[PDB]
A paper describes a structure:
Four mature saposins (SapA, SapB, SapC, and SapD) result from proteolysis of the precursor prosaposin as it traffics to the lysosome. The saposin family members are disulfide-linked, four-helix bundles that usually form dimers. One cargo, globotriaosylceramide (Gb3), is presented exclusively by SapB to GLA for removal of the terminal α-galactose, and failure of this process leads to accumulation of Gb3 in the lysosome and ultimately results in Fabry disease.
Third, we dissolved washed crystals in 0.1 % formic acid, subjected the sample to liquid-chromatography mass spectrometry (LC-MS) analysis, which indicated the presence of both SapB and Gb3-NBD. The SapB structure revealed a homodimer consisting of helical V-shaped monomers that form a ~2,900 Å3 binding cavity lined with hydrophobic residues. Given the above evidence for Gb3-NBD in the crystals, we were surprised to see only weak density in the ligand-binding cavity. Additionally, several hydrophobic residues on one face of a helix in the binding cavity showed little density beyond the beta carbon. We interpret the result as a collection of disordered ligands in the hydrophobic cavities of the SapB molecules in the crystalline state. Absent any cargo, the binding cavity collapses, and the cavity volume is minimal; but the presence of two Gb3-NBD increases the pocket volume closer to that seen in the crystal structure, suggesting that the SapB dimer in the crystal structure contains two or more ligands. Moreover, because the chains of the SapB:Gb3-NBD dimer align well with SapB dimers containing ligands, we propose that our structure represents an open and multi-ligand-bound SapB. Our simulations indicate that an open SapB dimer binds at least two Gb3-NBD molecules.
Residue numbers in the entry:
A (entry chain A): 1 to 78
B (entry chain B): -2 to 78
């Protein structure tokens, strides 16, 4: 679909950004951690530790598969 | 450069996702069914915890993403700005 093709385009350029931009992943992880602040006082911290331990497996898992597999896994393709 | 392409791809994809929710009656169903099936890779007690965390919070997720411009959504996930 349209959303499927857009997702493959996005994941392809994200893997390109991780390969070429050294600060892309750091800035992205810092931004998602900054969006954990919208939770409560105690529960923002577990959100940032959730990213702190699962960003690595997410980024490396993304870079070890093809983009159509990524979008098939997320749900925008097939 | 490479990250600006990611921002452009995000705007296009989120705009087409908003269109697909407004124009296809089965898009949201199939998407949340696939996300619930993807919870099964976790532990057997907590695959169901994952599934009903998706169930309790799919309504906020779809409706909040509906009442938002695609640029705000991409800025929130970090692919833009």
């Amino acid at each position: 679909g349209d959303v499927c093709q857009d997702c493959i385009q996005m994941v392809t350029d994200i893997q390109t950004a991780v390969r070429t931009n050294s600060t892309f992943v750091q800035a992205l992880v810092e931004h998602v951690k900054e969006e954990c602040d919208r939770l409560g006082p105690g529960m923002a911290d577990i959100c940032k530790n959730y990213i702190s331990q699962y960003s690595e497996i997410a980024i490396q898992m993304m870079m070890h598969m093809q983009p159509k597999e990524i979008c098939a896994l997320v749900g925008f393709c097939d």
